[PDB]
Design a protein around this motif. Structure first.
Motif, PDB file in Angstrom:
ATOM      1  N   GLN A   1      -1.488  10.423   7.052  1.00  0.00           N
ATOM      2  CA  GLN A   1      -1.434   9.292   6.139  1.00  0.00           C
ATOM      3  C   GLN A   1      -1.085   8.006   6.892  1.00  0.00           C
ATOM      4  O   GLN A   1      -0.152   7.986   7.674  1.00  0.00           O
ATOM      5  N   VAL A   2      -1.862   6.950   6.650  1.00  0.00           N
ATOM      6  CA  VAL A   2      -1.523   5.619   7.078  1.00  0.00           C
ATOM      7  C   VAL A   2      -1.162   4.781   5.871  1.00  0.00           C
ATOM      8  O   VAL A   2      -1.909   4.706   4.879  1.00  0.00           O
ATOM      9  N   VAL A   3       0.000   4.149   5.954  1.00  0.00           N
ATOM     10  CA  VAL A   3       0.498   3.308   4.891  1.00  0.00           C
ATOM     11  C   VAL A   3       0.674   1.914   5.421  1.00  0.00           C
ATOM     12  O   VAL A   3       1.260   1.700   6.503  1.00  0.00           O
ATOM     13  N   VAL A   4       0.200   0.961   4.644  1.00  0.00           N
ATOM     14  CA  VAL A   4       0.355  -0.445   4.958  1.00  0.00           C
ATOM     15  C   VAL A   4       0.993  -1.086   3.739  1.00  0.00           C
ATOM     16  O   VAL A   4       0.438  -1.006   2.620  1.00  0.00           O
ATOM     17  N   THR A   5       2.162  -1.696   3.942  1.00  0.00           N
ATOM     18  CA  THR A   5       2.919  -2.232   2.825  1.00  0.00           C
ATOM     19  C   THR A   5       2.871  -3.735   2.925  1.00  0.00           C
ATOM     20  O   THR A   5       3.030  -4.270   4.022  1.00  0.00           O
ATOM     21  N   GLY A   6       2.694  -4.414   1.788  1.00  0.00           N
ATOM     22  CA  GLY A   6       2.476  -5.858   1.794  1.00  0.00           C
ATOM     23  C   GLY A   6       3.001  -6.532   0.531  1.00  0.00           C
ATOM     24  O   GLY A   6       3.268  -5.871  -0.474  1.00  0.00           O
ATOM     25  N   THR A   7       3.143  -7.845   0.578  1.00  0.00           N
ATOM     26  CA  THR A   7       3.690  -8.586  -0.523  1.00  0.00           C
ATOM     27  C   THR A   7       2.724  -8.842  -1.655  1.00  0.00           C
ATOM     28  O   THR A   7       3.151  -9.134  -2.747  1.00  0.00           O
ATOM     29  N   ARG A   8       1.420  -8.764  -1.382  1.00  0.00           N
ATOM     30  CA  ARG A   8       0.382  -8.936  -2.412  1.00  0.00           C
ATOM     31  C   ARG A   8      -0.616  -7.806  -2.228  1.00  0.00           C
ATOM     32  O   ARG A   8      -0.713  -7.249  -1.113  1.00  0.00           O
TER      33      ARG A   8
ATOM     34  N   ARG B   1       1.314  -1.358  -1.600  1.00  0.00           N
ATOM     35  CA  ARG B   1       1.028  -0.392  -0.549  1.00  0.00           C
ATOM     36  C   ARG B   1      -0.424   0.033  -0.609  1.00  0.00           C
ATOM     37  O   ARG B   1      -0.985   0.317  -1.671  1.00  0.00           O
ATOM     38  N   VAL B   2      -1.071   0.029   0.552  1.00  0.00           N
ATOM     39  CA  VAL B   2      -2.400   0.536   0.694  1.00  0.00           C
ATOM     40  C   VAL B   2      -2.257   1.809   1.483  1.00  0.00           C
ATOM     41  O   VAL B   2      -1.687   1.808   2.592  1.00  0.00           O
ATOM     42  N   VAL B   3      -2.774   2.887   0.920  1.00  0.00           N
ATOM     43  CA  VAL B   3      -2.696   4.190   1.567  1.00  0.00           C
ATOM     44  C   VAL B   3      -4.066   4.700   2.047  1.00  0.00           C
ATOM     45  O   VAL B   3      -5.039   4.720   1.285  1.00  0.00           O
ATOM     46  N   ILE B   4      -4.156   5.098   3.306  1.00  0.00           N
ATOM     47  CA  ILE B   4      -5.352   5.784   3.769  1.00  0.00           C
ATOM     48  C   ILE B   4      -5.035   7.180   4.230  1.00  0.00           C
ATOM     49  O   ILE B   4      -4.306   7.352   5.177  1.00  0.00           O
TER      50      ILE B   4
END
Length: 108
Positions: free
Chosen positions: A16-23, A96-99
């Motif tokens: 799993q790759v997680v990218v966390t962001g404010t928008r 959060r965008v999850v791949i």
């Protein structure tokens, strides 16, 4: 910032790759070959993950990141060189965008 944290969870069933962001992020995901690669493009925010890739990720051989400018905006490209063929699945949840990178088994 847009992207605030970046996490990789290597595991044998799927990494799993997680990218966390404010928008909420606009993204596009696609594949490349020679070498096998997965590529994610992120808009408004350019999320770069590095040194988080473990020498024992069953899926990810390595990850390179670069941001390019379009006027005052920024597009970040994430590039994952692969150890095996994947069927990626991407979904968003809040900031959060999850791949998840699965092998060839898509459903149990």
């Amino acid at each position: 910032n847009t992207l605030r944290g970046l996490d990789v969870s290597r595991t044998g069933s799927g990494a799993q790759v997680v990218v966390t962001g404010t928008r909420p992020p606009t993204f596009t995901v696609f594949r490349l070959s020679g070498p096998e690669r997965l590529v994610v493009d992120l808009s408004s925010a350019d999320a770069t993950g590095i040194k988080g890739h473990h020498e024992g990720s069953g899926p990810v051989s390595g990850v390179v990141a670069s941001q390019f400018s379009d006027q005052r905006a920024s597009v970040g490209r994430v590039l994952l060189a692969l150890d095996k063929a994947s069927q990626y699945d991407v979904r968003a949840d809040g900031n959060r965008v999850v791949i998840s990178v699965d092998g060839t088994s898509q459903s149990v």
